[PDB]
Enzyme design. Structure first.
Site, PDB file in Angstrom:
ATOM      1  N   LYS A 146     -30.488  -3.908  22.038  1.00  0.00           N
ATOM      2  CA  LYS A 146     -30.382  -4.487  20.699  1.00  0.00           C
ATOM      3  C   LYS A 146     -31.762  -4.521  20.035  1.00  0.00           C
ATOM      4  O   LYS A 146     -32.779  -4.484  20.728  1.00  0.00           O
ATOM      5  CB  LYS A 146     -29.797  -5.900  20.768  1.00  0.00           C
ATOM      6  N   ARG A 177     -43.307   8.435  21.688  1.00  0.00           N
ATOM      7  CA  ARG A 177     -42.776   9.642  22.299  1.00  0.00           C
ATOM      8  C   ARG A 177     -43.309  10.896  21.596  1.00  0.00           C
ATOM      9  O   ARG A 177     -43.546  11.920  22.238  1.00  0.00           O
ATOM     10  CB  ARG A 177     -41.253   9.589  22.215  1.00  0.00           C
ATOM     11  CG  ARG A 177     -40.746   8.234  21.713  1.00  0.00           C
ATOM     12  CD  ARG A 177     -39.393   7.862  22.288  1.00  0.00           C
ATOM     13  NE  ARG A 177     -38.474   8.994  22.313  1.00  0.00           N
ATOM     14  CZ  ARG A 177     -37.262   8.956  22.854  1.00  0.00           C
ATOM     15  NH1 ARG A 177     -36.821   7.837  23.415  1.00  0.00           N
ATOM     16  NH2 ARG A 177     -36.491  10.035  22.837  1.00  0.00           N
TER      17      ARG A 177
END
Ligand SMILES: [Mn+2]
Ligand SMILES: [Mn+2]
Ligand SMILES: [Mn+2]
Lengths: 515, 517, 516
Positions: B298, B371
């Site tokens: 979440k 990333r």
């Protein structure tokens, strides 16, 4: 700001200004004469209905043989079937020539295009997937004579001209994976090949504009692209930029775009034909970067739809270009509402619109409708003429998908006659539409505000969502306009799983033909 | 930038650059020779297993008596038990001397460290609650000879050196609650005391960098801390930042940090030892400020994980410093991917980025940014340096999927070569900073990043398809063609912290990995 | 139940009990001897790698011609390419023969099967889409010699044998759209054709059971299918049903299924080979109807995964049948934990006494199904005639599995490193691949801490090795008698794909048994 980005954006601007279609058009008679029956490469496509594919005329085609005849028997409705034909003369010097047959369904409801160009696009796309050599030309033999929808469908299909794959970023984001396509009709086309090329070019430019990411297609680069075409084709271009919008009363578009790196711009184009025009039409397009939202869908859904938020502005722009290139007899204006919206910021703001009406921003996500209000008033109040018809196009609401679906843009329109005409234009062009509830009595109460003339979003989401967003825009129409207003919500038809569809331009072109 | 704020940052840089550990190392023989049976202070800690505590050698220790013997009996597994010893000789001048006994478990799976340094940290942490004075040295008697893991465990424990409590902000955020610790091994340690202190210093420096809030540890201050150690220890530092990154083609790291107040920085440190190096390793670290997100958890969960977003860059930096201090025979590079992901979710959504590797990335989710910066870092390491590495190791707090996959104590390993995997896994069990392998299978990872217009997206389409592995795969696609060695991707999203804050996870693992090269 | 339902349920039971495979196996030499260059029908398929497709032996094949050679050049990696061959000899007497070439990638990681049977299934499925007649036999020429994984891959492919389409519900839900398939290997298969057919039958039977909806494959009908196979193949069956579960201390499986219309059932099957068994293995399978849930994914996701809840019980059951039909030298027990989970607040915070004697607080009613495996695992390790050396539990347990290991690899939670390596080897050899998840009971036990009972049924923190913790819960209900290797296989995702059930599990078990 850096030199690397500056040059990248200039190169992209040039690529859109200098875009040429990969699709050419001819007929079977001229094809045999000009090309001497020699196929353009080792791949050819044959597309038509069950009845058309079994016509005697099909048997006389250069590539036809018993293997192709069996493909016509074995192919499924809405599917393709490929066969190799050995010893066929072709310009690629290939030992074999691949013939991919595609069956188009005859089934078509009263709200769809009878030629089913949706399937035609799908069929050719599947046929082009076999190609490993993209520098080849591919002959596409269509058995339908509906030249306009087929022209759009083929321009729509296959690999997109915009691409950043495999070094294409260094080549101004022009795809190297696209094949040249020669669409061969049975008869000489009722619309000249050069005109059909214009339609196909606009569909692909619109596709390029919508495919392009927001860091390439910006408010500045869109404006530069529009100004580039103005210089080339010789049409007038007016630009109201930055603080001049605030200073000249355009509070909606200014408020929505004031916090961006690039300033907001209201870019109006003007075309006037030689002699008496049949109608005076004003186009208004939503072109807001990083702007997509609502209450009907989840937040994650709108972030997906945000990818195609330039659809409205791209649609009207390319439809305008086609009108100038075909020299259609319509006095035309095209207002691009351009701004970068870069959650709590501007929430509960009261802005003074150009129309003089005040709007309470109860939801900052729904800014697109606000810029359309200023654009609509500009078109109907500030131009050198007062239009007979106003057409606003935008990727406005998630409700549109729930109401009219993925293939039909929602029409919200005040006059029935104009609605019927646009619906016919959708069925003729293949860029189909469907009406959305017009009933201002029930739309007005949803925008009730304690402090301003109106809010920017309906209080209750489940009370004709598409309609209410359309109604908001109509409240900012100038009093000196008393004609037909056509609001086109094309949130979903502008794209599919492969990206942009170039939906809009062909609908406009077909609409202007029957005026 | 205000003067008071500029003065605060300079002071914080100095505190990090000139940091020194509170831990010192010795053995029982040298302890009896140096201190003559006089305890360092009025608090002593005895930590060992059930069997080790009952060994005859324990009673020979200076603090032992019938009370301590009873403590060993009444203590519970993984718990503590304290007893007073009145008038026991000590240098602090305390009337009583508190002796805390801690029982370490022997149970340890084939994936865990046998010494269970995780519990050694907890037992000592609980023991230091009964400290009387702030200036005293607590003698910690460990009955295990696993020197490296016990060193890292003890450096890990107790009050953290970073603190803003009780006016510590005026003292460059240096805590005055950190007690001095003397680790007393049974036999002279296999690693020299001076070397173990460098390891504990790196663990606690790593902890300080991760504990530090984003208004203290910024892209500029991290760089200044890096540049400080370069001058102090004598290694090179390259710094590409701001519009230079964009001009040189590092579009990934640039796009992520271009909005911020302080520019994004690609900071490469180079260490080349004397003679022939046993291996040539390149380290890459994620250090993005205000950057944490994904689809597995979440949104509220990622804001909690954001707290420790420098963990990758800190672990890679501190491991480098230990190698320079211990003069390990490894030619080492260390690229810190530093950027502040500043200013909304909609901004830069659906952007196409031209990475340094030449491959294009469609940003479908702006929350998955580090990333991307790792892709530019990894290429830089494998393409732009004066040497070509044999191993590339990237470390980052990357995915929430890591917690679901490998848990709170094990960092996820995504590596192309089984051999390199086994080495790092052995290093994790030896060091205590444990790891566990995540699925390696590029065939099934590649399709998740399918894009209509770019070479790839930055996030997997389906979240329930090996989420730790997919994040790792993305990074590997930006490896240079020149590179043909072992790639080790370490996802340490969860092991970098616990309830008390940063853990200093990473540096010790890297050092133990370098030792066995 | 109404007579119309009872009739339908009995018809479905018979279809599963009497299921025969559509696939047969042979080799190129025997093929030439039997049908001498005459294709079985107007469709032929050639599946091999880029290198294999260009082998000189491919030119000599019955269907080969210049068009087929061109197909090998024009086909894409992982894709298919069809061509017509005019006047090719075929048993159907069709004027043209469609020859579909499919290219298999050689790329395969150290955690995947080298033959890439996942692509083989996709390639053959795509080829069978162009089939003219639904019944005819299609020759599928494979250029690989890895017979076992290719056998399961072909069994996996094409139209599924279960169907309710186009009046199939009047024919006991047997599909009429399935083609017969003749797999033709290059050399004579190392495993006998008849043995390969048994593997293919179990893959498809497993597929059928998972594909079946919960109103057809119920707790009652599964038992009747098992009892039907018991009589036919000749193995013993023990069934503990209803209140007898409660009376005999099986509180876990009883609590989960007590509210249903059909009672819960602990169905244990027993197979003993002649002579000395190589190993004594016990299988435990989760077969809970209308039972799927957790915290890692959204509620809507678990409803999608609920479709394939029988995957564990089906995999274990069909692996057993293959062992009985092949007469494998392994003493085998198979416990099916069957129950219908009806009807969220109900049974929340209940404390149940498991058969193991340990108590379980039900903090989350959605995760009741790990509980049934607890009772099953104890039964297999305590109540049987023998004490197993290996206990393999199989279940579609957690959404965390997909996040951890992915869609193609099942999650392995196992104590011994040797048993893990063996099962991993079985997965790579069979194609039904697996990957290990973190084993570390020290860090898993604290997640199930309870104030009043010995444990809870669900981890306190979802982000602390989700797949592993689910496995640990099951291991706590192992018997003190048992000191062997425990292999927990979480196959929540590998049991299905876009086209439905995959029949994942049986072939993994078969290949595991073969190398014991
Ligand atoms: Mn669609
Ligand atoms: Mn913890
Ligand atoms: Mn899949």
């Amino acid at each position: 700001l850096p030199k690397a980005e500056a040059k990248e954006l200039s190169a992209f601007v040039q690529s859109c200004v200098e875009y040429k279609t990969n699709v050419c058009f001819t007929d079977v008679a001229a094809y045999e004469s000009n090309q001497k029956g020699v196929l353009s490469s080792g791949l050819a496509v044959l597309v038509g209905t069950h009845k058309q594919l079994r016509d005697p005329a099909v048997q006389r085609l250069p590539f036809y043989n018993p293997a192709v005849a069996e493909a016509i028997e074995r192919v499924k409705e809405g599917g393709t079937y490929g066969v190799l034909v050995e010893g066929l003369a072709n310009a690629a010097g290939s030992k074999f020539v691949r013939v991919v047959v595609g069956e188009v369904p005859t089934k078509a409801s009263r709200n769809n295009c009878p030629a089913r160009p949706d399937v035609v696009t799908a069929l050719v796309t599947a046929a082009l997937d076999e190609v490993k050599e993209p520098n080849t030309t591919v002959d596409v033999f269509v058995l339908s004579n509906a030249v306009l929808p087929i022209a759009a469908a083929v321009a729509r299909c296959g690999k997109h001209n915009f691409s950043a794959k495999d070094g294409a970023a260094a080549a101004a984001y022009n795809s190297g994976k696209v094949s040249r396509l020669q669409v061969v009709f049975p008869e000489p086309p009722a619309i000249p090949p050069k005109d059909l090329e214009a339609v196909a070019t606009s569909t692909q430019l619109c596709q390029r504009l919508v495919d392009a990411p927001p860091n390439l297609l910006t408010t500045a680069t869109f404006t530069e692209i529009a100004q580039g075409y103005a210089k080339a084709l010789g049409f007038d271009v007016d630009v109201i930029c930055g603080d001049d919008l605030c200073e000249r009363g355009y509070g909606g578009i200014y408020s929505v775009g004031k916090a961006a790196f690039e300033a907001p711009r209201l870019v109006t184009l003007l075309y006037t034909p030689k002699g008496t025009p049949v109608k005076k039409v004003s186009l208004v397009g939503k072109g807001i970067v990083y702007d997509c939202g609502g209450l009907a869908l989840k937040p994650a859904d709108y972030m997906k739809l945000m990818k195609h938020d330039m659809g409205g502005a791209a649609a009207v722009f390319c439809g305008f270009l086609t009108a100038v290139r075909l020299q259609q007899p319509v006095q035309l204006s095209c207002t691009l509402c351009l701004a970068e919206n870069a959650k709590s910021y501007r929430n509960d703001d009261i802005i003074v619109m150009k129309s003089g009406k005040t709007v309470e921003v109860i939801n900052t996500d729904a800014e697109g409708r606000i810029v359309l209000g200023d654009g609509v008033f500009h078109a109907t109040n500030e131009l050198s003429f007062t239009p007979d018809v106003v057409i606003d196009m935008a990727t406005l609401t998630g409700a549109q998908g729930i109401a009219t679906g993925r293939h039909h843009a929602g029409l919200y329109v005040n006059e029935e006659g104009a609605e019927a005409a646009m619906l016919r234009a959708g069925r003729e062009s293949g860029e189909t539409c469907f009406p959305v509830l017009y009933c201002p009595e029930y739309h007005e109460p949803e925008f009730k505000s304690n402090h301003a003339d109106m809010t920017n979003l309906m209080e209750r989401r489940d009370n004709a969502g598409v309609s209410c967003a359309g109604y908001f825009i109509t409240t900012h129409l100038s009093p000196k306009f008393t004609g037909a207003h056509i609001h086109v919500d094309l949130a979903y038809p502008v794209f599919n799983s492969n990206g942009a569809t170039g939906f809009g331009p062909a609908l406009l072109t077909e609409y202007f033909r029957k005026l």
